[PDB]
Amino acid sequence: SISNLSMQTHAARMRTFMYWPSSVPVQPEQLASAGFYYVGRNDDVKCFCCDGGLRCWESGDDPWVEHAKWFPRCEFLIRMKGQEFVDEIQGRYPHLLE
Ligand SMILES: *CCC(=O)NC[C@H]1CC[C@H]2C=C[C@@H](C(=O)NCc3ccccc3)N2C(=O)[C@H]1NC(=O)[C@H](C)NC
Ligand SMILES: [Zn+2]
């Protein structure tokens, strides 16, 4: 089941980015679409579904890819991007989370 149901909508996730830092190259839209909302602290975001947090976003970061890198069994991730996408990311980073 879903970890944070108040953040299940894209619109709700999007509202959380009001004070999103300008230093941070990734945009709210790409993050919100990947299931992530802002927790109000530095560049910390959390997935509404798996409750996995990411931070320290770098230029060129793709939120979906970072999602599959660290929380590959998130169901929202798998439903939206599919098990192939996730397997590919994991096969390319086989020794993260080992
Ligand atoms: C994105 C810029 C930045 O903050 N970089 C690194 C730091 C991330 C955030 C702090 C907050 C706690 C700790 C952390 O991430 N803990 C999770 C964890 C780590 C290891 C095992 C279990 C849980 N943070 C950092 O590690 C922190 N790192 C540093 O400041 C490093 C030591 N120096 C650049
Ligand atoms: Zn997730």
mmCIF file with all atom_site columns, C-alpha atoms and ligand atoms in Angstrom:
data_model
loop_
_atom_site.group_PDB
_atom_site.id
_atom_site.type_symbol
_atom_site.label_atom_id
_atom_site.label_alt_id
_atom_site.label_comp_id
_atom_site.label_asym_id
_atom_site.label_entity_id
_atom_site.label_seq_id
_atom_site.pdbx_PDB_ins_code
_atom_site.Cartn_x
_atom_site.Cartn_y
_atom_site.Cartn_z
_atom_site.occupancy
_atom_site.B_iso_or_equiv
_atom_site.pdbx_formal_charge
_atom_site.auth_seq_id
_atom_site.auth_comp_id
_atom_site.auth_asym_id
_atom_site.auth_atom_id
_atom_site.pdbx_PDB_model_num
ATOM   1   C  CA  . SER A 1 1  ? 0.000  0.000  0.000   1.00 0.00 ? 1  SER A CA  1
ATOM   2   C  CA  . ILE A 1 2  ? 0.773  3.703  -0.475  1.00 0.00 ? 2  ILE A CA  1
ATOM   3   C  CA  . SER A 1 3  ? 2.987  5.332  2.187   1.00 0.00 ? 3  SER A CA  1
ATOM   4   C  CA  . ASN A 1 4  ? 1.670  8.967  2.030   1.00 0.00 ? 4  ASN A CA  1
ATOM   5   C  CA  . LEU A 1 5  ? -1.838 9.206  0.547   1.00 0.00 ? 5  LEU A CA  1
ATOM   6   C  CA  . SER A 1 6  ? -1.978 12.958 0.997   1.00 0.00 ? 6  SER A CA  1
ATOM   7   C  CA  . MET A 1 7  ? 0.776  13.093 -1.729  1.00 0.00 ? 7  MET A CA  1
ATOM   8   C  CA  . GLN A 1 8  ? -0.854 10.679 -4.193  1.00 0.00 ? 8  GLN A CA  1
ATOM   9   C  CA  . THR A 1 9  ? -1.829 13.418 -6.625  1.00 0.00 ? 9  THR A CA  1
ATOM   10  C  CA  . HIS A 1 10 ? 0.726  15.161 -8.873  1.00 0.00 ? 10 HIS A CA  1
ATOM   11  C  CA  . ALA A 1 11 ? -0.933 18.522 -8.034  1.00 0.00 ? 11 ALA A CA  1
ATOM   12  C  CA  . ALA A 1 12 ? -0.472 17.965 -4.283  1.00 0.00 ? 12 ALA A CA  1
ATOM   13  C  CA  . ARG A 1 13 ? 3.172  16.944 -4.794  1.00 0.00 ? 13 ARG A CA  1
ATOM   14  C  CA  . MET A 1 14 ? 3.656  19.995 -6.931  1.00 0.00 ? 14 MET A CA  1
ATOM   15  C  CA  . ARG A 1 15 ? 2.348  22.325 -4.221  1.00 0.00 ? 15 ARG A CA  1
ATOM   16  C  CA  . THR A 1 16 ? 5.142  21.165 -1.929  1.00 0.00 ? 16 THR A CA  1
ATOM   17  C  CA  . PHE A 1 17 ? 7.798  22.774 -4.104  1.00 0.00 ? 17 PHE A CA  1
ATOM   18  C  CA  . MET A 1 18 ? 6.812  26.430 -3.317  1.00 0.00 ? 18 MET A CA  1
ATOM   19  C  CA  . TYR A 1 19 ? 10.191 27.158 -1.644  1.00 0.00 ? 19 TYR A CA  1
ATOM   20  C  CA  . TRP A 1 20 ? 12.279 24.728 -3.766  1.00 0.00 ? 20 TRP A CA  1
ATOM   21  C  CA  . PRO A 1 21 ? 15.881 25.989 -3.839  1.00 0.00 ? 21 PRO A CA  1
ATOM   22  C  CA  . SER A 1 22 ? 17.167 27.752 -6.962  1.00 0.00 ? 22 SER A CA  1
ATOM   23  C  CA  . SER A 1 23 ? 20.665 26.303 -6.652  1.00 0.00 ? 23 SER A CA  1
ATOM   24  C  CA  . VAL A 1 24 ? 19.265 22.910 -7.495  1.00 0.00 ? 24 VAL A CA  1
ATOM   25  C  CA  . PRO A 1 25 ? 19.216 22.080 -11.195 1.00 0.00 ? 25 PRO A CA  1
ATOM   26  C  CA  . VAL A 1 26 ? 16.369 19.527 -11.267 1.00 0.00 ? 26 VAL A CA  1
ATOM   27  C  CA  . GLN A 1 27 ? 12.861 20.942 -11.700 1.00 0.00 ? 27 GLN A CA  1
ATOM   28  C  CA  . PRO A 1 28 ? 9.736  20.324 -9.559  1.00 0.00 ? 28 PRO A CA  1
ATOM   29  C  CA  . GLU A 1 29 ? 7.790  18.999 -12.516 1.00 0.00 ? 29 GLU A CA  1
ATOM   30  C  CA  . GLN A 1 30 ? 10.269 16.190 -13.248 1.00 0.00 ? 30 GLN A CA  1
ATOM   31  C  CA  . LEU A 1 31 ? 10.416 15.349 -9.516  1.00 0.00 ? 31 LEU A CA  1
ATOM   32  C  CA  . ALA A 1 32 ? 6.689  15.461 -8.903  1.00 0.00 ? 32 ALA A CA  1
ATOM   33  C  CA  . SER A 1 33 ? 6.067  13.264 -11.926 1.00 0.00 ? 33 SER A CA  1
ATOM   34  C  CA  . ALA A 1 34 ? 8.524  10.711 -10.506 1.00 0.00 ? 34 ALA A CA  1
ATOM   35  C  CA  . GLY A 1 35 ? 6.381  10.450 -7.412  1.00 0.00 ? 35 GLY A CA  1
ATOM   36  C  CA  . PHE A 1 36 ? 8.455  12.819 -5.253  1.00 0.00 ? 36 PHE A CA  1
ATOM   37  C  CA  . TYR A 1 37 ? 7.380  15.734 -2.991  1.00 0.00 ? 37 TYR A CA  1
ATOM   38  C  CA  . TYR A 1 38 ? 9.478  18.306 -1.129  1.00 0.00 ? 38 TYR A CA  1
ATOM   39  C  CA  . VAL A 1 39 ? 9.912  17.914 2.663   1.00 0.00 ? 39 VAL A CA  1
ATOM   40  C  CA  . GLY A 1 40 ? 11.017 21.546 3.204   1.00 0.00 ? 40 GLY A CA  1
ATOM   41  C  CA  . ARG A 1 41 ? 14.653 20.898 4.035   1.00 0.00 ? 41 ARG A CA  1
ATOM   42  C  CA  . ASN A 1 42 ? 17.554 21.554 1.701   1.00 0.00 ? 42 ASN A CA  1
ATOM   43  C  CA  . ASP A 1 43 ? 16.945 19.481 -1.476  1.00 0.00 ? 43 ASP A CA  1
ATOM   44  C  CA  . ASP A 1 44 ? 15.278 16.538 0.382   1.00 0.00 ? 44 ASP A CA  1
ATOM   45  C  CA  . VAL A 1 45 ? 12.396 14.775 -1.405  1.00 0.00 ? 45 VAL A CA  1
ATOM   46  C  CA  . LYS A 1 46 ? 10.372 11.687 -0.603  1.00 0.00 ? 46 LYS A CA  1
ATOM   47  C  CA  . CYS A 1 47 ? 8.214  9.291  -2.780  1.00 0.00 ? 47 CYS A CA  1
ATOM   48  C  CA  . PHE A 1 48 ? 4.544  9.225  -1.765  1.00 0.00 ? 48 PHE A CA  1
ATOM   49  C  CA  . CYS A 1 49 ? 4.535  5.482  -2.460  1.00 0.00 ? 49 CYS A CA  1
ATOM   50  C  CA  . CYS A 1 50 ? 7.679  3.817  -1.162  1.00 0.00 ? 50 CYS A CA  1
ATOM   51  C  CA  . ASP A 1 51 ? 8.629  6.607  1.309   1.00 0.00 ? 51 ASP A CA  1
ATOM   52  C  CA  . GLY A 1 52 ? 12.247 6.497  -0.056  1.00 0.00 ? 52 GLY A CA  1
ATOM   53  C  CA  . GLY A 1 53 ? 14.093 9.782  0.238   1.00 0.00 ? 53 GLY A CA  1
ATOM   54  C  CA  . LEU A 1 54 ? 16.501 11.284 -2.134  1.00 0.00 ? 54 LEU A CA  1
ATOM   55  C  CA  . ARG A 1 55 ? 18.730 14.360 -1.751  1.00 0.00 ? 55 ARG A CA  1
ATOM   56  C  CA  . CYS A 1 56 ? 21.871 15.948 -3.280  1.00 0.00 ? 56 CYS A CA  1
ATOM   57  C  CA  . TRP A 1 57 ? 20.478 16.308 -6.757  1.00 0.00 ? 57 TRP A CA  1
ATOM   58  C  CA  . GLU A 1 58 ? 23.138 16.970 -9.416  1.00 0.00 ? 58 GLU A CA  1
ATOM   59  C  CA  . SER A 1 59 ? 22.969 18.471 -12.900 1.00 0.00 ? 59 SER A CA  1
ATOM   60  C  CA  . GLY A 1 60 ? 21.761 15.847 -15.414 1.00 0.00 ? 60 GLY A CA  1
ATOM   61  C  CA  . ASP A 1 61 ? 19.956 13.815 -12.718 1.00 0.00 ? 61 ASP A CA  1
ATOM   62  C  CA  . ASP A 1 62 ? 16.836 12.061 -14.003 1.00 0.00 ? 62 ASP A CA  1
ATOM   63  C  CA  . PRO A 1 63 ? 14.369 11.517 -11.160 1.00 0.00 ? 63 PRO A CA  1
ATOM   64  C  CA  . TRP A 1 64 ? 12.976 8.246  -12.499 1.00 0.00 ? 64 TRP A CA  1
ATOM   65  C  CA  . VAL A 1 65 ? 16.436 6.806  -12.938 1.00 0.00 ? 65 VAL A CA  1
ATOM   66  C  CA  . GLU A 1 66 ? 17.463 7.824  -9.425  1.00 0.00 ? 66 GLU A CA  1
ATOM   67  C  CA  . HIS A 1 67 ? 14.178 6.245  -8.197  1.00 0.00 ? 67 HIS A CA  1
ATOM   68  C  CA  . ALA A 1 68 ? 15.046 2.913  -9.849  1.00 0.00 ? 68 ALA A CA  1
ATOM   69  C  CA  . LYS A 1 69 ? 18.647 3.110  -8.630  1.00 0.00 ? 69 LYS A CA  1
ATOM   70  C  CA  . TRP A 1 70 ? 17.796 3.226  -4.929  1.00 0.00 ? 70 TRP A CA  1
ATOM   71  C  CA  . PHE A 1 71 ? 14.162 2.075  -4.538  1.00 0.00 ? 71 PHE A CA  1
ATOM   72  C  CA  . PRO A 1 72 ? 13.762 -0.445 -7.378  1.00 0.00 ? 72 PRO A CA  1
ATOM   73  C  CA  . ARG A 1 73 ? 10.888 -2.261 -5.690  1.00 0.00 ? 73 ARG A CA  1
ATOM   74  C  CA  . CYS A 1 74 ? 8.697  0.850  -5.428  1.00 0.00 ? 74 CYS A CA  1
ATOM   75  C  CA  . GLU A 1 75 ? 5.302  -0.139 -6.882  1.00 0.00 ? 75 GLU A CA  1
ATOM   76  C  CA  . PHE A 1 76 ? 4.545  3.321  -8.278  1.00 0.00 ? 76 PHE A CA  1
ATOM   77  C  CA  . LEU A 1 77 ? 7.927  3.275  -10.041 1.00 0.00 ? 77 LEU A CA  1
ATOM   78  C  CA  . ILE A 1 78 ? 7.233  -0.204 -11.534 1.00 0.00 ? 78 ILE A CA  1
ATOM   79  C  CA  . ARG A 1 79 ? 3.653  0.618  -12.552 1.00 0.00 ? 79 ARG A CA  1
ATOM   80  C  CA  . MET A 1 80 ? 4.736  3.862  -14.262 1.00 0.00 ? 80 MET A CA  1
ATOM   81  C  CA  . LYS A 1 81 ? 8.097  2.851  -15.775 1.00 0.00 ? 81 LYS A CA  1
ATOM   82  C  CA  . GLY A 1 82 ? 7.795  -0.944 -15.841 1.00 0.00 ? 82 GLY A CA  1
ATOM   83  C  CA  . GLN A 1 83 ? 9.990  -3.792 -14.667 1.00 0.00 ? 83 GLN A CA  1
ATOM   84  C  CA  . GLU A 1 84 ? 12.269 -3.694 -17.757 1.00 0.00 ? 84 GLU A CA  1
ATOM   85  C  CA  . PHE A 1 85 ? 13.333 -0.106 -17.087 1.00 0.00 ? 85 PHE A CA  1
ATOM   86  C  CA  . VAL A 1 86 ? 14.081 -0.930 -13.519 1.00 0.00 ? 86 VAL A CA  1
ATOM   87  C  CA  . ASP A 1 87 ? 15.997 -4.166 -14.380 1.00 0.00 ? 87 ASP A CA  1
ATOM   88  C  CA  . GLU A 1 88 ? 18.123 -2.193 -16.862 1.00 0.00 ? 88 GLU A CA  1
ATOM   89  C  CA  . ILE A 1 89 ? 19.073 0.395  -14.185 1.00 0.00 ? 89 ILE A CA  1
ATOM   90  C  CA  . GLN A 1 90 ? 19.838 -2.305 -11.653 1.00 0.00 ? 90 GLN A CA  1
ATOM   91  C  CA  . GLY A 1 91 ? 21.910 -4.295 -14.186 1.00 0.00 ? 91 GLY A CA  1
ATOM   92  C  CA  . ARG A 1 92 ? 23.919 -1.145 -14.842 1.00 0.00 ? 92 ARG A CA  1
ATOM   93  C  CA  . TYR A 1 93 ? 24.431 -0.477 -11.079 1.00 0.00 ? 93 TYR A CA  1
ATOM   94  C  CA  . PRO A 1 94 ? 24.689 -4.095 -9.801  1.00 0.00 ? 94 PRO A CA  1
ATOM   95  C  CA  . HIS A 1 95 ? 26.695 -3.299 -6.623  1.00 0.00 ? 95 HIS A CA  1
ATOM   96  C  CA  . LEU A 1 96 ? 24.616 -0.430 -5.230  1.00 0.00 ? 96 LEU A CA  1
ATOM   97  C  CA  . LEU A 1 97 ? 22.418 -1.806 -2.434  1.00 0.00 ? 97 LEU A CA  1
ATOM   98  C  CA  . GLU A 1 98 ? 24.758 -4.874 -2.247  1.00 0.00 ? 98 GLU A CA  1
HETATM 99  C  C1  . LIG B 2 .  ? 23.817 17.127 -0.890  1.00 0.00 ? 1  LIG B C1  1
HETATM 100 C  C2  . LIG B 2 .  ? 24.906 17.842 -0.107  1.00 0.00 ? 1  LIG B C2  1
HETATM 101 C  C3  . LIG B 2 .  ? 25.131 17.058 1.158   1.00 0.00 ? 1  LIG B C3  1
HETATM 102 O  O1  . LIG B 2 .  ? 24.455 17.339 2.136   1.00 0.00 ? 1  LIG B O1  1
HETATM 103 N  N1  . LIG B 2 .  ? 26.000 16.037 1.049   1.00 0.00 ? 1  LIG B N1  1
HETATM 104 C  C4  . LIG B 2 .  ? 26.279 14.966 2.013   1.00 0.00 ? 1  LIG B C4  1
HETATM 105 C  C5  . LIG B 2 .  ? 25.520 14.958 3.348   1.00 0.00 ? 1  LIG B C5  1
HETATM 106 C  C6  . LIG B 2 .  ? 24.099 14.479 3.071   1.00 0.00 ? 1  LIG B C6  1
HETATM 107 C  C7  . LIG B 2 .  ? 23.118 14.795 4.204   1.00 0.00 ? 1  LIG B C7  1
HETATM 108 C  C8  . LIG B 2 .  ? 23.674 14.547 5.585   1.00 0.00 ? 1  LIG B C8  1
HETATM 109 C  C9  . LIG B 2 .  ? 22.504 14.368 6.546   1.00 0.00 ? 1  LIG B C9  1
HETATM 110 C  C10 . LIG B 2 .  ? 22.753 13.069 7.294   1.00 0.00 ? 1  LIG B C10 1
HETATM 111 C  C11 . LIG B 2 .  ? 23.775 12.247 6.504   1.00 0.00 ? 1  LIG B C11 1
HETATM 112 C  C12 . LIG B 2 .  ? 23.091 11.155 5.735   1.00 0.00 ? 1  LIG B C12 1
HETATM 113 O  O2  . LIG B 2 .  ? 22.929 11.321 4.546   1.00 0.00 ? 1  LIG B O2  1
HETATM 114 N  N2  . LIG B 2 .  ? 22.760 10.058 6.417   1.00 0.00 ? 1  LIG B N2  1
HETATM 115 C  C13 . LIG B 2 .  ? 22.133 8.879  5.851   1.00 0.00 ? 1  LIG B C13 1
HETATM 116 C  C14 . LIG B 2 .  ? 22.937 7.621  6.138   1.00 0.00 ? 1  LIG B C14 1
HETATM 117 C  C15 . LIG B 2 .  ? 24.271 7.571  5.839   1.00 0.00 ? 1  LIG B C15 1
HETATM 118 C  C16 . LIG B 2 .  ? 25.017 6.426  6.084   1.00 0.00 ? 1  LIG B C16 1
HETATM 119 C  C17 . LIG B 2 .  ? 24.419 5.327  6.671   1.00 0.00 ? 1  LIG B C17 1
HETATM 120 C  C18 . LIG B 2 .  ? 23.063 5.374  6.983   1.00 0.00 ? 1  LIG B C18 1
HETATM 121 C  C19 . LIG B 2 .  ? 22.333 6.522  6.726   1.00 0.00 ? 1  LIG B C19 1
HETATM 122 N  N3  . LIG B 2 .  ? 24.389 13.247 5.655   1.00 0.00 ? 1  LIG B N3  1
HETATM 123 C  C20 . LIG B 2 .  ? 25.528 12.993 5.043   1.00 0.00 ? 1  LIG B C20 1
HETATM 124 O  O3  . LIG B 2 .  ? 26.049 11.882 4.987   1.00 0.00 ? 1  LIG B O3  1
HETATM 125 C  C21 . LIG B 2 .  ? 26.236 14.195 4.503   1.00 0.00 ? 1  LIG B C21 1
HETATM 126 N  N4  . LIG B 2 .  ? 27.610 13.827 4.217   1.00 0.00 ? 1  LIG B N4  1
HETATM 127 C  C22 . LIG B 2 .  ? 28.650 14.672 4.392   1.00 0.00 ? 1  LIG B C22 1
HETATM 128 O  O4  . LIG B 2 .  ? 28.597 15.822 4.852   1.00 0.00 ? 1  LIG B O4  1
HETATM 129 C  C23 . LIG B 2 .  ? 29.982 14.124 3.971   1.00 0.00 ? 1  LIG B C23 1
HETATM 130 C  C24 . LIG B 2 .  ? 30.529 13.329 5.154   1.00 0.00 ? 1  LIG B C24 1
HETATM 131 N  N5  . LIG B 2 .  ? 30.917 15.214 3.658   1.00 0.00 ? 1  LIG B N5  1
HETATM 132 C  C25 . LIG B 2 .  ? 30.633 15.770 2.310   1.00 0.00 ? 1  LIG B C25 1
HETATM 133 ZN ZN  . ZN  B 3 .  ? 8.941  5.202  -4.769  1.00 0.00 ? 2  ZN  B ZN  1
#
